[PDB]
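Predict the holo structure. Ligand: T6H.
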Amino acid sequence: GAMGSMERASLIQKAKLAEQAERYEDMAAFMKGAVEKGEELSNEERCLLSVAYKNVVGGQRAAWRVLSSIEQKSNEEGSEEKGPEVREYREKVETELQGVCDTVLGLLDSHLIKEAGDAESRVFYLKMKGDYYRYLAEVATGDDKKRIIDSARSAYQEAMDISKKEMPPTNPIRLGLALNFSVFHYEIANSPEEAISLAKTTFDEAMADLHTLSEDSYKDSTLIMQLLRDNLTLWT
Amino acid sequence: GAMGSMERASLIQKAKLAEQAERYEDMAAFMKGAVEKGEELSNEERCLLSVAYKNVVGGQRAAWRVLSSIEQKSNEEGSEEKGPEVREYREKVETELQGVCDTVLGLLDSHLIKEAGDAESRVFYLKMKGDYYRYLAEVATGDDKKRIIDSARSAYQEAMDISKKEMPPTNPIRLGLALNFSVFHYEIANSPEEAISLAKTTFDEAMADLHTLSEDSYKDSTLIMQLLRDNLTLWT
Amino acid sequence: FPATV
Amino acid sequence: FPATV
Ligand SMILES: *SCCNC(=O)C(C)(C)Oc1ccccc1
Ligand SMILES: *SCCNC(=O)C(C)(C)Oc1ccccc1
Ligand SMILES: [Mg+2]
Ligand SMILES: [Mg+2]
């Protein structure tokens, strides 16, 4: 790895600089190097890893959607044949996206998840596993598509099971997991009723637990609750 | 070159797709491949080349400024020593920026400028030469800094001389050249009075020529005139 | 598109 | 920063 010679602490420091500079590819490379040092990550370090790759793959997803839309329109009847270029370039972006997802999934499997024993680390990583299999499912068309979808579901479900046993219903990791698993149900699994039921129950159980929180914890929890409500409004 | 096997027309088509997807690094790679086919570029193709690299280097410049500011503050008295990391990462971004500038300057020198005989192509390329030497000057500190600044000035000045002989004062290339050369004077050459005089005279000479234009040409010219006025307002 | 974090 | 095109 090109980061193998750089100190762990220096990689983390540079990831934070890259975040301030909005250089998310560099941020992700620095955090990959940090993970590959082999030590467990702290809460803040897990957030740097997740922010970096979320921004990288989020830009790839947005570009893939633009290209896929152009490709779909080029394939409608009455459209002039423009050659293989749109499909080729969509495939190029898709392969780079799949490469990033494979890299994140590889860090989770070697060896972040197996060393994560506390609920806040293990739920976080299993959420990330569900998310990156979900991004693979968004572009998947082959023999393995059902298995990709089921890999996302399985990771999300294990995270859910731990979070319900070990975390309060307002915990922001538990909330963000539920938000994303609900989106999985709606957009990937063709299960809009499960998506809506999960978002609603998550929102209501968090509401009833807000009274236990400090002002700062309240802000964190209500921020994600608003996203759950925003999705519910979109879907109903 | 990794684009050597792709048809010129396919590279141009993909550059346009990359622009729609906001994938400016890919756009620039496709346009580099197109230039390297060795044929002259059309007006539209010159715009695709310039947009692609402007966006790539513009993001690098913004990141470099953020990092340089952090570095300057870390070097103020009373600041805690944080090690070599800020300087190293600023240097990494700076070297990647210089690499992009060298690549554009290399395309201009081999062989876009020497084959550009019409004013609209030659002025455009010499403007670009001035711009990429200006971006090198923004980060330059060594023995060659004065020569880098003078290379930008010389390219801008040749472009100016041709544009004044061969183009009307409302031509958008002539206007954009003057806008950028005025910024060179203000920000690079420490010549704010020359910057203001150039912007003012350019604006006034264009104003007096607007009556000759169609509605669409008027829109193009007045758009750049407004930028000249915006700079004048910033500077006075 | 729906919100995710 | 000033405007350039
Ligand atoms: S880990 C990044 C910081 N956290 C957040 O921005 C919020 C949205 C408050 O919480 C989560 C982020 C990522 C996953 C779960 C919760
Ligand atoms: S070449 C990109 C299209 N042109 C423009 O956006 C405007 C600003 C109208 O004109 C110029 C751009 C670049 C250089 C000179 C003029
Ligand atoms: Mg060490
Ligand atoms: Mg050919």
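The domain at 8-235 of chain A is CATH 1.20.190.20 (Delta-Endotoxin; domain 1). Residues 6 and 33 of chain A are 8 Å apart (CA to CA).
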